[PDB]
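Notes continue from the previous slide.

Worked example: a multi-chain complex. Inputs as given:
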Amino acid sequence: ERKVEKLLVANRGEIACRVFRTCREMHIRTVALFCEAERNAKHVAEADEAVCIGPPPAVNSYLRGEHIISVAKQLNVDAIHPGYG
Amino acid sequence: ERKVEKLLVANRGEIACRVFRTCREMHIRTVALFCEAERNAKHVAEADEAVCIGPPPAVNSYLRGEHIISVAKQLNVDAIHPGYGFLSENASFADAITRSGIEFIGPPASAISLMGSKSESKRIMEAAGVPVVPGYYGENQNVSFLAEEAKKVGFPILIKAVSGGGGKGMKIVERPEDFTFMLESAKREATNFFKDDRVILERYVKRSRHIECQIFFDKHGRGVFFFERDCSVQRRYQKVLEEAPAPHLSMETRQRIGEVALQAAKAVGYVGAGTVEFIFDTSTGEFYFMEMNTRLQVEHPVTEEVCRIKGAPLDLVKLQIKTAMGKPLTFSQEDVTLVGSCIEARVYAESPERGFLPESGPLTFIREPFQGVRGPARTRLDTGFREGDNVLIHYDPMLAKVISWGRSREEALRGLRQALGEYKVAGINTNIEFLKRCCETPEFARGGVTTNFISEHESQLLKSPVVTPEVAAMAATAWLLNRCDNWRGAFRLNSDTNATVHFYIDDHPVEVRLHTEGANYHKIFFSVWDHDGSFEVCSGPVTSKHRDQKSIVNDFTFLFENGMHHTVLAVATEGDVTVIGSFGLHQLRLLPLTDGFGDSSTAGGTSTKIVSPMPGKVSKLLVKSGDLVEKGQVLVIVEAMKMEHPVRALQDGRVSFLVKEGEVVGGDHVLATVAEEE
């Protein structure tokens, strides 16, 4: 099998905090994602590292899947949980 | 039996708080002891009463056993727990306590005295019949005697010598039926290392792994051995990390380790808690006695995580008070069962890069790892220091102990990793980075590590993360802002701002330059090691206006252009900038730039120095010729009508006298030439 030490989250909100929490028990790293501004949000204050992705409209933010994948590759991420939406 | 309501502690540190805590549950009083000052320390803030004992040196403090006993008598103390160190191993102190009538906690004085000398102790165990590997048999009376007992007393051949660690007589001769090389090796050893011609033969073990079982005894003839332990990992005879469940140890053996241990303790007679230490070779498969300690160890809470009595949590110190109570036990060796695994590590206020030399300094910020249960593991931290405390050089460097109990070894080891990572201290370099390096790359997760395990992997270890050029950016920025309004309200004309910081990383100065474009304090750039980028930075509340030695501790946020974001709690001072974050901890030394700013004189000072007026009559010159004079001492004193009028020259460099005392000299004479030391 393949070891996992880094977890990536796509969406934002309640699911971000939920995915982040249990992660602590499994003792795994965390990564957060946020749109323009949206940096005071709680989830980013819960993760280990957060990255800004771009303009507020959903077309611009959380839909550039290729850019997300390139960023994750640069971070050498182990797993991604898209969430819902 | 005798009632106890007052408890006395000898030593200071983690043991003081531990002994104090359980005491609350038994509902017993407490008393604390402290050296000169040392009154803000935590333990004294935990007891009921504290007494100052005297000067910092250990001779003056915690060693005046008679004074301690007199003070305890005046307080009508019921019991004293020495702890470990100081008077932990001193039979005279225990005998004096017994004569005073106070219930000493520990073994009787006879056992301590007997075990004080190694020869008489090994004599006692040899009489008892415990397998013991001795240090010597007779002497080298005959060279044929070596062949006689080579295959007799000890088949394994340990030639060595009478003394000295050179050991070239050994030659690692593990092959029996050796008779033409052992004598030649011994005779070549005798050359240039004659010492005494007596030679001692023993068994030679290829591998060594340390074992140490725990034991407990009442005073009514009843006891029970606790679970074994492992101390394979140690550097320079200093304990580093240990495991209560010796991985890879058969149950049957565990049982037997007990029967041997109980025989030895019964033979000498024993009361209280103690530990027997063995030495073991995997190839032989047998254990041989090395030493025992008649004192509570530091590793007591570790073995606790792997033992339960009657299904209830075990408290080792509790029983020792109950043993002092005179009550008999309640459980056989059976009621105790092991459950799961645990690992321990010690953190030392030393510098791994340096010669593991202790450092003393105030404790700026101390992160506390989550000491609660979660997942399949229990993690705890015990620290004898808190925020605002300062490390004393007289004491040993010892901050805290971290233990990860678990249902399986894996869980335990994994737990620590994360915890060891989480705990953070700022102000003094620590070996915490070393311990994590000892845990990740070395494949000791298997469980087989020898006594010398640390020695071979020294190349692999002693390694720390590389300071990326970005780390300098956040570190450099914090020092400015955490000192003043740099980049705050700044303004120039038709130009842009600039401010630079110099870091003395390693032995090479480092320069970082920061500047802004636009009307934005927010938009900031950087150029370190010919690497350029942009980021924005948003600070937090301004704190510590007094900017004392602790200086300012504030959280920072940095949004670099690429897209990342970071949070950094920076306690910055003039000496260094410390940044703690997901990268880890890094302290960057600021390039020192101090050198008697003012008194920087390279003048030759050839002639016409400390010239005296006309009357002359020099006398009583108190300076040696050719000795450095930087401070303005009285080089020459001349008297003019009772006018000493000392010249008091401050020109640096050695001063050369051309005059002698009592010699009348003319006006403005060259009494001496104050020249730079060449």
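Summary box: Chain B touches chain A at residues 374-375, 414-415, 417-418, 557, 559, 563-566, 582 (CB under 8 Å). Chain B is about 20% helix and 20% strand.
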